[PDB]
CSV table of C-alpha atoms and ligand atoms in Angstrom, one decimal:
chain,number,residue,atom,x,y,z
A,233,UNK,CA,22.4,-6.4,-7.4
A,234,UNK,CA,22.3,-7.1,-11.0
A,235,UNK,CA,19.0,-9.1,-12.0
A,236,UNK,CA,18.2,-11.7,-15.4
A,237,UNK,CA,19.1,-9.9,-18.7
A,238,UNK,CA,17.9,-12.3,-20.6
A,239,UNK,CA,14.8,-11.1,-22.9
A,240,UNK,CA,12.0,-11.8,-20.6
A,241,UNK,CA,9.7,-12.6,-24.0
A,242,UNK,CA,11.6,-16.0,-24.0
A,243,UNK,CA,10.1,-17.1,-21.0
A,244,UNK,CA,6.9,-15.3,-20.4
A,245,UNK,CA,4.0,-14.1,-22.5
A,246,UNK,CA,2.4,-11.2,-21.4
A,247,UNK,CA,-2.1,-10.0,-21.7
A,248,UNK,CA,-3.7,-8.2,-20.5
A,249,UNK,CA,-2.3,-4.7,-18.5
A,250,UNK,CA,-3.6,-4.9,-15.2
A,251,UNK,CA,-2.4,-1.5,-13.8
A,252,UNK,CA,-0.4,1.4,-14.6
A,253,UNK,CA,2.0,4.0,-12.8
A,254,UNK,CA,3.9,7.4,-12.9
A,255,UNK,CA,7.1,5.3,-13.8
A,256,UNK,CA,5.6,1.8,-14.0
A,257,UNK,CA,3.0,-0.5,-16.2
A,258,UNK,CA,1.6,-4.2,-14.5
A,259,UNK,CA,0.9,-6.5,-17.5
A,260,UNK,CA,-0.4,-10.2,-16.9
A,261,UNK,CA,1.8,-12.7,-18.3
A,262,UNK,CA,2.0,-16.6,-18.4
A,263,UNK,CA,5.7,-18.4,-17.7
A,264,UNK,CA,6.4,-20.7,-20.4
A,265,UNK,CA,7.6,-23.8,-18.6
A,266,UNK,CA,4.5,-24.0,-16.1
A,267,UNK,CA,2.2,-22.3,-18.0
A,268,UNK,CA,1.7,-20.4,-14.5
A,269,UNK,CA,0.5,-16.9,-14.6
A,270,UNK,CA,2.3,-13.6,-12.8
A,271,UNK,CA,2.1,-9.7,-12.8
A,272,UNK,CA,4.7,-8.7,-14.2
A,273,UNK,CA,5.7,-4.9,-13.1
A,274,UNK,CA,7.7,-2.9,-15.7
A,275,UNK,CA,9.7,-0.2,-13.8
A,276,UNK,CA,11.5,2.5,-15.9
A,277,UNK,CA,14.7,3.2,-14.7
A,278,UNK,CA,16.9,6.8,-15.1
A,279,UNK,CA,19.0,7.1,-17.8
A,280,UNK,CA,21.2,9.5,-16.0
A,281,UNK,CA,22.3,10.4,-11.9
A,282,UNK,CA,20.6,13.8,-12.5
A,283,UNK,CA,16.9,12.8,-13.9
A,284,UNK,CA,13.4,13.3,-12.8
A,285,UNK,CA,12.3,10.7,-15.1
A,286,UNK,CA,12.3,6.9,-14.2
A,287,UNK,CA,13.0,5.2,-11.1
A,288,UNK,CA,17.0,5.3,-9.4
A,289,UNK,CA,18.6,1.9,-8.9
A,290,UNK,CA,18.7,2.8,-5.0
A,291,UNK,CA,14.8,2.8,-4.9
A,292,UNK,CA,14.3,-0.1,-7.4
A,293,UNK,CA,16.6,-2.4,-5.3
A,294,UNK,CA,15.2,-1.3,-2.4
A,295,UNK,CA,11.6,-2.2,-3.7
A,296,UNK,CA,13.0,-6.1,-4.9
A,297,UNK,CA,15.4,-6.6,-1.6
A,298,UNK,CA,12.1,-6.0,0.5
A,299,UNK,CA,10.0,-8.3,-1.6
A,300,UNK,CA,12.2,-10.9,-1.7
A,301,UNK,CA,12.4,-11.1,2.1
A,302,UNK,CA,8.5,-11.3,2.3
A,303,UNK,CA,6.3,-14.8,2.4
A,304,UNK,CA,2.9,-14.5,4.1
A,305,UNK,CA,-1.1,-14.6,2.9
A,306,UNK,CA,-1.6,-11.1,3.2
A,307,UNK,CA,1.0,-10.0,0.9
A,308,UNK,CA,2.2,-10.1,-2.6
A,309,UNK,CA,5.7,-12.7,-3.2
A,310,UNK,CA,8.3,-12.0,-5.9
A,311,UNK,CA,8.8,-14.8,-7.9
A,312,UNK,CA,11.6,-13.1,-10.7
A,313,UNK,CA,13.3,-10.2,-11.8
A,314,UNK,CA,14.9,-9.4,-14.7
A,315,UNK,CA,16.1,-6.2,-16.5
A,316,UNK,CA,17.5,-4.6,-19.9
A,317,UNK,CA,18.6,-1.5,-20.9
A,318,UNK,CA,14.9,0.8,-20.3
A,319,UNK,CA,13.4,-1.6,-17.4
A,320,UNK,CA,13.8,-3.8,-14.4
A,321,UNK,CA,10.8,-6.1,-14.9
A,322,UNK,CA,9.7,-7.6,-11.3
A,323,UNK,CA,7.4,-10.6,-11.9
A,324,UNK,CA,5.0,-10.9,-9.3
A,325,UNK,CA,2.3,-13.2,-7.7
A,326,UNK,CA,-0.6,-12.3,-9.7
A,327,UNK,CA,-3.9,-11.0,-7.6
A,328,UNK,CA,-6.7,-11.2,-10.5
A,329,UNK,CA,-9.7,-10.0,-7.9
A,330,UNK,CA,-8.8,-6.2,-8.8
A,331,UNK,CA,-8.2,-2.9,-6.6
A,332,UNK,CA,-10.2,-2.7,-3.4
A,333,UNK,CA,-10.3,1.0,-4.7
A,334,UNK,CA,-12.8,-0.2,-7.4
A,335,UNK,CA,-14.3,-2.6,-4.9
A,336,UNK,CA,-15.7,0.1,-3.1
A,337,UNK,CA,-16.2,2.5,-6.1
A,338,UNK,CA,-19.1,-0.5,-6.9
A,339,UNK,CA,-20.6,-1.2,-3.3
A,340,UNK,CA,-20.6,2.4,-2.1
A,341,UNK,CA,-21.0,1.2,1.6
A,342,UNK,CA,-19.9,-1.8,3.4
A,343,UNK,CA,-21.2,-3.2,6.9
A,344,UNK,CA,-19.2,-3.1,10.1
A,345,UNK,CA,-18.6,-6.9,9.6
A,346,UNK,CA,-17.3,-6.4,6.0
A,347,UNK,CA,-15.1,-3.8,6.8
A,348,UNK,CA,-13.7,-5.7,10.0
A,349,UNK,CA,-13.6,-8.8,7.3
A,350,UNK,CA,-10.9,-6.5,4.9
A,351,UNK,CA,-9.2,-4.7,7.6
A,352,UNK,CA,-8.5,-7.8,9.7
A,353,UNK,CA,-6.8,-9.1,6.6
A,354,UNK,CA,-5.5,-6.0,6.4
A,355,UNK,CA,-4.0,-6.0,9.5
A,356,UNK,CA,-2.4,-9.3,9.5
A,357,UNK,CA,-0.5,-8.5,7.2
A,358,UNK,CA,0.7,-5.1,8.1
A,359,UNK,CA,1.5,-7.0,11.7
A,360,UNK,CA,3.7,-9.5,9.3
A,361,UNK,CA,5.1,-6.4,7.7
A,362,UNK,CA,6.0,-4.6,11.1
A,363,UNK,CA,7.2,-7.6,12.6
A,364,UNK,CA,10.2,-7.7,9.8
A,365,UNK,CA,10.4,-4.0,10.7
A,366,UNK,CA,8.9,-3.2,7.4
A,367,UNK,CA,6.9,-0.3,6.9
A,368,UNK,CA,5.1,0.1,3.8
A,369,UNK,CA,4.2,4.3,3.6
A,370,UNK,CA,2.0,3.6,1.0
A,371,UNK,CA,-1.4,2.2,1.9
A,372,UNK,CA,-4.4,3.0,0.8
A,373,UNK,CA,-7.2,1.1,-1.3
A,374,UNK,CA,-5.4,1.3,-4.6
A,375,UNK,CA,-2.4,-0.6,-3.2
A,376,UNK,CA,-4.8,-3.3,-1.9
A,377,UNK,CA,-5.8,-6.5,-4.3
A,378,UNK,CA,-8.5,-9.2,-4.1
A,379,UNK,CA,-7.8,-12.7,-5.1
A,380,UNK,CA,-11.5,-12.9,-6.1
A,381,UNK,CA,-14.1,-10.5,-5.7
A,382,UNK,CA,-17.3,-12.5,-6.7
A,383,UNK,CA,-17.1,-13.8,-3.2
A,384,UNK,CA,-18.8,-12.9,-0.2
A,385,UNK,CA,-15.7,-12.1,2.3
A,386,UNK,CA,-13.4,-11.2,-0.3
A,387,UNK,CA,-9.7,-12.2,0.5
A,388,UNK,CA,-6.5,-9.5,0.0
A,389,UNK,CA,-3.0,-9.2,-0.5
A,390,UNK,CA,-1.2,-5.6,-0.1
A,391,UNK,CA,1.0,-4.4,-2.8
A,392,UNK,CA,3.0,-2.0,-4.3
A,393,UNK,CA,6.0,-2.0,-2.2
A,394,UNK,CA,7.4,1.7,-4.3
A,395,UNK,CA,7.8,3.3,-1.2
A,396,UNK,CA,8.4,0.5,1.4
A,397,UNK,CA,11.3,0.4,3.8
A,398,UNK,CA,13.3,-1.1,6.6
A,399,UNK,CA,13.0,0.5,10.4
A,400,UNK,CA,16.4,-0.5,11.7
A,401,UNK,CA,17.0,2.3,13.7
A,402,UNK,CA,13.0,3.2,15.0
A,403,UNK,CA,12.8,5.4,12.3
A,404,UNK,CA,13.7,6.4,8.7
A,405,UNK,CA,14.5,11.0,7.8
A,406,UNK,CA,14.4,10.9,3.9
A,407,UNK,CA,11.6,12.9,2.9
A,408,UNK,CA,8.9,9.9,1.8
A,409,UNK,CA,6.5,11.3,0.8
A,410,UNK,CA,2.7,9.0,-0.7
A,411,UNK,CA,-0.8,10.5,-1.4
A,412,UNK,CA,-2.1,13.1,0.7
A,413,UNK,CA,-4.9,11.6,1.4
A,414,UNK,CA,-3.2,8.9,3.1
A,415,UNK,CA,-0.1,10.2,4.8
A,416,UNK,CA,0.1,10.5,8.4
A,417,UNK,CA,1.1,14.3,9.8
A,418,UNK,CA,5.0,13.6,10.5
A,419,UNK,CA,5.0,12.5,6.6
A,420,UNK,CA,3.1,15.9,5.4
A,421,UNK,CA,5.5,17.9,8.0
A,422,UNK,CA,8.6,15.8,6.9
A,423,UNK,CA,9.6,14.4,10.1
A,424,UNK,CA,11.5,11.1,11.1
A,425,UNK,CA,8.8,8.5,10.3
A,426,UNK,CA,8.6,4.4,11.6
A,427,UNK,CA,6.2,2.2,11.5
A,428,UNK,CA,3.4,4.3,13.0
A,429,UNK,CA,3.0,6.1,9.5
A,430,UNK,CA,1.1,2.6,8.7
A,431,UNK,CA,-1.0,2.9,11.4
A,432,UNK,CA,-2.7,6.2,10.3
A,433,UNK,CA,-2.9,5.4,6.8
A,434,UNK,CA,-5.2,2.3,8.2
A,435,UNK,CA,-7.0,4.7,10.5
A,436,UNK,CA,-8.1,6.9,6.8
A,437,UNK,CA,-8.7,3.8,5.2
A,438,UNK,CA,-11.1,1.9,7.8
A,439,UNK,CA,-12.9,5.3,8.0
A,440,UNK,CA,-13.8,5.2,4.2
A,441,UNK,CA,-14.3,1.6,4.5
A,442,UNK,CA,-17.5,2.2,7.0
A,443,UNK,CA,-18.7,5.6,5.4
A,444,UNK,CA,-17.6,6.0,1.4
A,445,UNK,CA,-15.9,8.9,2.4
A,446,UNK,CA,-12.6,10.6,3.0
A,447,UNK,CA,-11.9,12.4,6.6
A,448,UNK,CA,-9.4,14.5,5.3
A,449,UNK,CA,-9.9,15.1,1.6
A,450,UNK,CA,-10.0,18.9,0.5
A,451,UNK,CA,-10.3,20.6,-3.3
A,452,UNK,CA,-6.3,20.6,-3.5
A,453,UNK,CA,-3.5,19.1,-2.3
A,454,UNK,CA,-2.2,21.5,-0.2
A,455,UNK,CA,-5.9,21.5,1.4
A,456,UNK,CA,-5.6,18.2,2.0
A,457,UNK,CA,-2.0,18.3,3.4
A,458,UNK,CA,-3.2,21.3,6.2
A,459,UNK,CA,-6.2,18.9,7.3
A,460,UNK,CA,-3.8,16.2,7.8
A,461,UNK,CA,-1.3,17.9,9.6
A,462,UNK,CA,-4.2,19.5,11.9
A,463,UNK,CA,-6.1,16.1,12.5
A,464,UNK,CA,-8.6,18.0,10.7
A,465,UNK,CA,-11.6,15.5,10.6
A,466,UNK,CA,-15.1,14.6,12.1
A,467,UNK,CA,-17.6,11.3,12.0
A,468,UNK,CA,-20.3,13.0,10.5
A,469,UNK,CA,-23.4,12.0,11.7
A,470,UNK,CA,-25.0,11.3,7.8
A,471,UNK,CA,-22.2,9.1,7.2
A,472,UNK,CA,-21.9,7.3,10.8
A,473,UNK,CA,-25.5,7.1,12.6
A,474,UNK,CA,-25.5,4.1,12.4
A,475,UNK,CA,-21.7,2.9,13.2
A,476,UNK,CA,-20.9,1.5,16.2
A,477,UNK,CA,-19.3,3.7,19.2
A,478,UNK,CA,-16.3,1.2,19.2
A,479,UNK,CA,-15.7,1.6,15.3
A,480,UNK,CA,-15.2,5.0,16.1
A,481,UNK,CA,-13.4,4.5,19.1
A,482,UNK,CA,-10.8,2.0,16.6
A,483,UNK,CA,-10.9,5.4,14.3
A,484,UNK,CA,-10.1,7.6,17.0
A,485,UNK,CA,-6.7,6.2,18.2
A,486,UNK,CA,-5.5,6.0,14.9
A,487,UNK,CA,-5.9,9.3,13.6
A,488,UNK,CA,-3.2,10.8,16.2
A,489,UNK,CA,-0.8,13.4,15.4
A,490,UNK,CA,1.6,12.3,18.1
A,491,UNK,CA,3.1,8.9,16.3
A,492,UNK,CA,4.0,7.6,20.3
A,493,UNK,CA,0.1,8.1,21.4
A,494,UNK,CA,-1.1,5.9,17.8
A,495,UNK,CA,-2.2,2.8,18.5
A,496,UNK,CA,0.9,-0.1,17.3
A,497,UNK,CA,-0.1,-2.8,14.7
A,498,UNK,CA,-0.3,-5.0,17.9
A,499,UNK,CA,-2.8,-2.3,20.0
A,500,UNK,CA,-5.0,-2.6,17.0
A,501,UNK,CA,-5.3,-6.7,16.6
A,502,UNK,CA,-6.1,-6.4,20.7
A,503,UNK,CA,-8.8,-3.5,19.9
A,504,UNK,CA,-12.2,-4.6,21.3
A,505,UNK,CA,-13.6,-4.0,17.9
A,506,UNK,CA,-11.5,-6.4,16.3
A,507,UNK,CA,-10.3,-9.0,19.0
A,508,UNK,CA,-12.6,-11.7,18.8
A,509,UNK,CA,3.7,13.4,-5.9
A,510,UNK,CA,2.1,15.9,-3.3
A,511,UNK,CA,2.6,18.6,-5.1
A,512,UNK,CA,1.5,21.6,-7.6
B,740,LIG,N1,0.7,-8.3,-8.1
B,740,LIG,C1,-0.2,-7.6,-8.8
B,740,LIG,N2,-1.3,-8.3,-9.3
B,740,LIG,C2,-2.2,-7.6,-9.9
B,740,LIG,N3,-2.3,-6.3,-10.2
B,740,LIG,C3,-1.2,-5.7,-9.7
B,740,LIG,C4,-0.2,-6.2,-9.0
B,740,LIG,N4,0.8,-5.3,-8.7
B,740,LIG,C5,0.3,-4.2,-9.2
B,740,LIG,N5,-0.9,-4.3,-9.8
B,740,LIG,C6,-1.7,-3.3,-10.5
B,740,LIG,O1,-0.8,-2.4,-11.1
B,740,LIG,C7,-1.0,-1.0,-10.5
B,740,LIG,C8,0.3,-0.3,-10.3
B,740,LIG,O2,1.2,-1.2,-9.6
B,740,LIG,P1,2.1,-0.6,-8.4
B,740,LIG,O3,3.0,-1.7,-7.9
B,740,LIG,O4,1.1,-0.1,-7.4
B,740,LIG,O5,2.9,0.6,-8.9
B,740,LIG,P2,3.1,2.0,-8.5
B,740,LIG,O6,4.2,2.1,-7.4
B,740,LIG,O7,1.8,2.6,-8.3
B,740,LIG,N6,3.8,2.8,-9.8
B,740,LIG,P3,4.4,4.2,-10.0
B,740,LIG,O8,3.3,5.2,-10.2
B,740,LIG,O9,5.3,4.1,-11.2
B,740,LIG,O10,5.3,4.5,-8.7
B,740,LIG,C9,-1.8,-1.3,-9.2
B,740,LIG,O11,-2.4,-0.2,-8.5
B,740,LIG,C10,-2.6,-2.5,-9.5
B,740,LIG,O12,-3.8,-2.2,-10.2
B,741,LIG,MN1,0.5,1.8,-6.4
């Protein structure tokens, strides 16, 4: 698909740089005739079939088709996209509240209530996501916004949808590969993967969510990668006296090697606790 090549400067003014990436800078901007303000995502694209450098038209279509499909609270919207020469420039629906990621960094620890408060957010929209048949492959708190974080029960929107995908066929054998942190064991052993990759990646994040730390993190990648793949990970008692037994219990079923024993997006919203790149 061929997007606006008309010099985005003519109709937006961009600020302040809100976020930055391998092969990708976020800048705030302001569109001229509303005076309405956006994200607007600057992704380099390859100057040649054979690069390493910038982002192929396969993955940068993939990343605008998938947004443009995608209308719902707990997600980010596409609004435009335009392109030149060097970029393909996706404006987005701004989130102005920052990163959860430095939410945390500045709170440390939240309660059982405020994590449930994020994750159940969270999980709406990953159900909204899943539902469409969408799976992201790249949560974590850095691809997680707040509209406003000088409120109590801040509200989110996912983003980032890089690495995002379509499950037509139950599952998707192309080597995706996200942070090592975060990747479920089928990702770090590159086997088919679906929409149960999601479901892990929310099992790490509600864990650091409750305790301010990671379950699998090591001193190196490749660390990292063997705890993963090994479910290598324990609620250590400094960190979790005082968590409830069902938090852990929501923890549990996540963290599952076998993607067909994890708990679905919709196991998860029925939960009793809830129910009310990687290399060298
Ligand atoms: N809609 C948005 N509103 C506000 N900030 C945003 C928005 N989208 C992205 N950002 C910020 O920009 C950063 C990078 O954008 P993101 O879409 O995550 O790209 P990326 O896939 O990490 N880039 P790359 O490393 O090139 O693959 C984020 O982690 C946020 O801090
Ligand atoms: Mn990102």
């Amino acid at each position: 698909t061929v997007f606006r090549q008309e010099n985005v400067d003519d109709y937006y003014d961009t600020g302040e740089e809100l976020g930055s990436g391998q092969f990708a800078v976020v800048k705030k901007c302001r569109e001229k005739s509303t005076g309405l303000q956006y994200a607007a995502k600057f992704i380099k694209k390859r100057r040649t079939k054979s690069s390493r450098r910038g982002v192929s038209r396969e993955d940068i279509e993939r990343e605008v088709s998938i947004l443009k499909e995608i209308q719902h609270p707990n997600v980010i919207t596409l609004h435009e996209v335009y392109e030149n020469k060097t970029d393909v420039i996706l404006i987005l629906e701004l989130v102005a509240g920052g990163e959860l990621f430095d939410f945390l960094a500045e709170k440390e620890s939240l309660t059982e209530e405020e994590a449930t408060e994020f994750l159940k957010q969270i999980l709406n929209g990953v159900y909204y996501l899943h539902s469409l048949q969408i799976a992201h492959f790249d949560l974590k708190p850095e691809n997680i916004m707040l509209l406003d974080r000088n409120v109590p029960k801040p509200r989110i929107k996912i983003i980032d949808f890089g690495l995002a995908h379509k499950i037509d066929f139950g599952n998707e054998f192309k080597n995706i590969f996200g942070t090592p942190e975060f990747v479920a064991p089928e990702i770090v052993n590159y086997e088919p993967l679906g929409l149960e990759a999601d479901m892990w990646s929310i099992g790490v994040i509600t864990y650091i969510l409750l305790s301010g730390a990671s379950p699998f993190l090591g001193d190196t990648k490749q660390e990292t990668l063997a705890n993963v793949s090994a479910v290598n990970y324990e609620f250590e008692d400094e960190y979790f006296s005082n968590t409830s037994a069902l938090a852990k219990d929501f923890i549990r079923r996540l963290l599952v090697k076998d993607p067909k024993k994890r708990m679905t997006i919709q196991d998860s919203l029925q939960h009793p606790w809830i129910k009310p790149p990687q290399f060298e």
